[PDB]
């Protein structure tokens, strides 16, 4: 029954909230994946008539193997011993049923990059969506990525596909949704579940796919992608490029332009979190305030998006 170790206190699923089946009620697939379907769906504690608990219900499939059942239980104690505002919550499990569930706060807006791109405005359907809207998401994530650093968690892989959000309209809130990548490290010492193609080489420093050495400033390195995507309004990183072509560009100092219409306080700060030399790299706490600058400048927040 392996353990998990956070800031530094010691938990096994025996800590883990264990949400009585009955209680559960699935409502609809929200999309799912390859391994695993995600649910949205209620608890109705206690059990009642309502107001029962919205959440999302993560599946592990009933023909795994014994590893995959231990990465399912780590992804849930890992998640569960943060308290973050950034941060999804875990409600709870359910893993003495089967197939066995891992319930977490319902992110009705979506994942980040889909939610750009669905929201880009367009004309038909108008600009509903603009600068400050970008810098509050950033502000959001860079908020959680602080919060990992200062509890020493390297995430491995802030990408707009890993962000949630709250809901679709104004007073969103984005969250860091997904830690399958930190989860894996945790478990062997190395990516033995995935391989080269598996790994999101876009948003890694040059130290971590020549090395193999991550630190916070790897996730230093992975916003400053992540920024770039908020950006652009949710294209690809180094839209014409390999993942090969990009670790020889990256290597030998390219990189990516701004995003259309990207004021240049906030390429200066994607630029800075792409210093070669991770000591050049700024940390969290600066990231986020410079964030805020940004937010201040009506000459950035008074920018307009472009319309494709
Ligand atoms: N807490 C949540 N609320 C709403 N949607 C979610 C939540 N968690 C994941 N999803 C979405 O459900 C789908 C499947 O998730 P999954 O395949 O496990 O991907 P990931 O590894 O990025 O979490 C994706 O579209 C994902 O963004």
């Given at each position: 029954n392996p353990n998990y170790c956070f800031a530094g206190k010691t938990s096994s699923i025996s800590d883990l909230k264990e949400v009585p089946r009955k209680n559960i009620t699935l409502i609809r697939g929200?999309?799912?994946?390859?391994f695993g379907e995600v649910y949205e769906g209620q608890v109705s504690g206690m059990p009642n008539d309502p107001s029962p608990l919205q959440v999302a219900v993560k599946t592990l499939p009933e023909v795994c193997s014994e590893q995959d059942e231990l990465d399912f239980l780590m992804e849930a104690l890992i998640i569960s011993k943060f308290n973050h505002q950034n941060i999804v919550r875990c409600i709870g499990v359910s893993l003495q049923s089967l197939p066995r569930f891992i319930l977490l706060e319902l992110m009705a807006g979506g994942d980040l990059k889909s939610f750009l791109r669905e929201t880009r405005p367009r004309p038909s359907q108008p600009s509903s969506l603009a600068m400050l809207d970008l810098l509050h998401v950033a502000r959001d994530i860079a908020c959680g990525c602080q919060y990992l650093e200062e509890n020493h968690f390297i995430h491995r892989d802030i990408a707009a596909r890993n962000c949630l959000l709250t809901c679709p309209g104004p007073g969103r809130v984005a969250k860091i949704g997904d830690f399958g990548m930190a989860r894996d490290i945790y478990r062997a010492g190395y990516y033995r579940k995935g391989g080269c193609a598996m790994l999101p080489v876009k948003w890694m420093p040059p130290e971590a796919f020549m090395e193999g050495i991550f630190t916070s400033k790897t996730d230093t390195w992975s916003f400053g992608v992540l920024l770039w995507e908020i950006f652009s309004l949710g294209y690809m990183p180094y839209?014409?490029?390999?993942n090969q072509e990009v670790l020889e560009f990256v290597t030998s100092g390219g990189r990516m332009d701004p995003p259309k219409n990207c004021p240049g306080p906030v390429y200066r700060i994607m630029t800075q979190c792409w210093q070669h030399q991770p000591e050049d790299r700024p940390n969290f706490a600066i990231i986020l305030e410079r964030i805020e600058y940004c937010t201040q400048d009506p000459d950035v927040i008074n920018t307009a998006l472009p319309i494709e």
């Open positions: 929200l999309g799912h994946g390859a839209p014409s490029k390999s």
